Amino acid sequence: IPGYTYGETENRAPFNLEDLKLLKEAVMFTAEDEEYIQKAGEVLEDQVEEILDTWYGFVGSHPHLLYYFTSPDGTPNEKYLAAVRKRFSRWILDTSNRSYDQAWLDYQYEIGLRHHRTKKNQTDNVESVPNIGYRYLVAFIYPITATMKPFLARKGHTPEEVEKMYQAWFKATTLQVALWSYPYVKYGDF
Amino acid sequence: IPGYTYGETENRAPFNLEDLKLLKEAVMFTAEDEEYIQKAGEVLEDQVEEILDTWYGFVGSHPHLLYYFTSPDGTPNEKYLAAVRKRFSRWILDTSNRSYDQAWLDYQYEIGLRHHRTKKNQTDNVESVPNIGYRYLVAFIYPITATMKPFLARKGHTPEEVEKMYQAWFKATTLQVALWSYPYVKYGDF
Numbered sequence: 001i002p003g004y005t006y007g008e009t010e011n012r013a014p015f016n017l018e019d020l021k022l023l024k025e026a027v028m029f030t031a032e033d034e035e036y037i038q039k040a041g042e043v044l045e046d047q048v049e050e051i052l053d054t055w056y057g058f059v060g061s062h063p064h065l066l067y068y069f070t071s072p073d074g075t076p077n078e079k080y081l082a083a084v085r086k087r088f089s090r091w092i093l094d095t096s097n098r099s100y101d102q103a104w105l106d107y108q109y110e111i112g113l114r115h116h117r118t119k120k121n122q123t124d125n126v127e128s129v130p131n132i133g134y135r136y137l138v139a140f141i142y143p144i145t146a147t148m149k150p151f152l153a154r155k156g157h158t159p160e161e162v163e164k165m166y167q168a169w170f171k172a173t174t175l176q177v178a179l180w181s182y183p184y185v186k187y188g189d190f
Numbered sequence: 191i192p193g194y195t196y197g198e199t200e201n202r203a204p205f206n207l208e209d210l211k212l213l214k215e216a217v218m219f220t221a222e223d224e225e226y227i228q229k230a231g232e233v234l235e236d237q238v239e240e241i242l243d244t245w246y247g248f249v250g251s252h253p254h255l256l257y258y259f260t261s262p263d264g265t266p267n268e269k270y271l272a273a274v275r276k277r278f279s280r281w282i283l284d285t286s287n288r289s290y291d292q293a294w295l296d297y298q299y300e301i302g303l304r305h306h307r308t309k310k311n312q313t314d315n316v317e318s319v320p321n322i323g324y325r326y327l328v329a330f331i332y333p334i335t336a337t338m339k340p341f342l343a344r345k346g347h348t349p350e351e352v353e354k355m356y357q358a359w360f361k362a363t364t365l366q367v368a369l370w371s372y373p374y375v376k377y378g379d380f
């Protein structure tokens with residue numbers, strides 16, 4: 001997979017392993033979540049393909065959003081919309097499968113920079129908008145969540161065991177997007 | 191109410207009214223939410239009091255969190271933990287009642303600065319930690335949400351009409367916290 005530099009970042013995560021403990025705590029993540037995430041994962045793996053479509057159906061309906069993929073002239077750099085689509089789809093099962101250990105943190109950091117102007121579009125060789133406005137990152141917590149509820153219950157799951165899956169996806173996202181802000185935030189305020 | 195400077199900000203919201211349209215869209219907020227928020231509101235008003243306790247029960251259980259209220263020596267500046275508690279409780283019904291118009295935006299901005307080192311603790315005359323690390327703001331999306339589900343259904347509401355209330359609270363938070371980041375983010379990256 002092209003540009004998937006997981007574990008081969010080799011520039012350290014300027015946030016430590018203790019940090020994720022305190023943040024996990026803020027986002028109320030308990031080991032009792034760890035089970036249902038992995039479950040959630042195995043719920044989604046097979047179905048993954050349809051998920052990217054639903055989600056791409058969304059970004060695609062909004063211009064102020066799709067713009068963030070468009071070449072300098074304002075039309076979607078698709079060699080760039082098939083290379084992200086790939087890495088992101090690696091990510092969903094990475095959220096249901098990697099243990100949240102240091103290298104997972106090395107790369108949470110990397111994905112911030114990839115949204116940031118520090119390292120947006122370098123990976124994928126394309127010419128496109130300079131930076132992604134952080135406001136939308138935060139925003140993407142809701143759709144990336146809501147749109148997931150339906151999928152979690154299609155492979156047949158009781159209405160309260162599913163709730164624990166969604167509830168786990170919810171927390172897992174907020175936590176991530178939380179760490180991504182580093183290159184966005186003025187030093188000392190993160 | 192002391193320090194509740196809603197509508198008497200008189201320094202403009204450096205984000206405009208168009209901005210909230212595009213962001214509302216990212217956070218998937220439709221007029222069909224506008225109804226259930228106000229509903230949610232009238233669900234919560236009476237119950238408000240207990241809500242601050244539950245929530246204060248939480249921040250209070252975590253030191254890395256409560257620290258953000260403590261005097262320079264490291265013990266909770268309570269004249270500061272009774273003055274916030276007040277303004278915040280004005281806020282819940284402000285989220286269920288103000289229409290999201292320009293002055294509502296003037297003050298969303300204000301509340302960022304109040305979390306930021308630009309204007310943290312000035313309002314309330316206390317001596318305390320310089321800045322609130324933005325990572326926790328993002329994080330506070332989950333508890334401020336999860337802890338709300340139970341309350342929304344206590345005043346007797348069917349299991350699918352309630353879901354629309356929570357779903358509306360969810361979106362309404364992400365949106366807010368989204369705007370608060372302005373003083374935190376390096377200029378041009380917001």
Ligand code: HEM
Pocket residue numbers: 003004059065066068069084087088089090091111114115119120121122123124132136137138139140141144173177
């Ligand atoms: C909930 C917040 C978001 C999540 C979870 C998310 C997810 C992802 C993932 C997993 C990747 C690939 C990372 C990898 O290399 O493995 C990615 C890249 C990318 N995403 Fe996001 N995304 C979010 C917010 C946004 C928003 C709001 C936009 C604007 C439409 C956006 C546009 C992009 C772009 C342009 C890249 C390419 C990075 C580069 O330039 O190299 N993302 N995203």
Ligand code: HEM
Pocket residue numbers: 193194249255256258259274277278279280281301304305309310311312313314322326327328329330331334363367
């Ligand atoms: C979901 C995100 C959050 C929400 C919705 C929220 C809510 C609020 C509200 C409504 C106020 C009063 C605003 C007013 O003046 O009317 C406030 C103030 C305050 N909150 Fe937050 N809060 C969040 C995140 C946090 C976090 C993570 C902390 C750290 C424990 C924190 C600590 C404080 C402090 C220290 C103030 C006082 C501002 C000052 O210094 O004047 N908040 N918050």
Ligand SMILES: [C-]#N
Pocket residue numbers: 059088
């Ligand atoms: C990212 N979509």
Ligand SMILES: [C-]#N
Pocket residue numbers: 249278
């Ligand atoms: C703010 N609690």
Ligand SMILES: [Xe]
Pocket residue numbers: 051055144147148
């Ligand atoms: Xe998704």
Ligand SMILES: [Xe]
Pocket residue numbers: 241245334337338
């Ligand atoms: Xe709350």
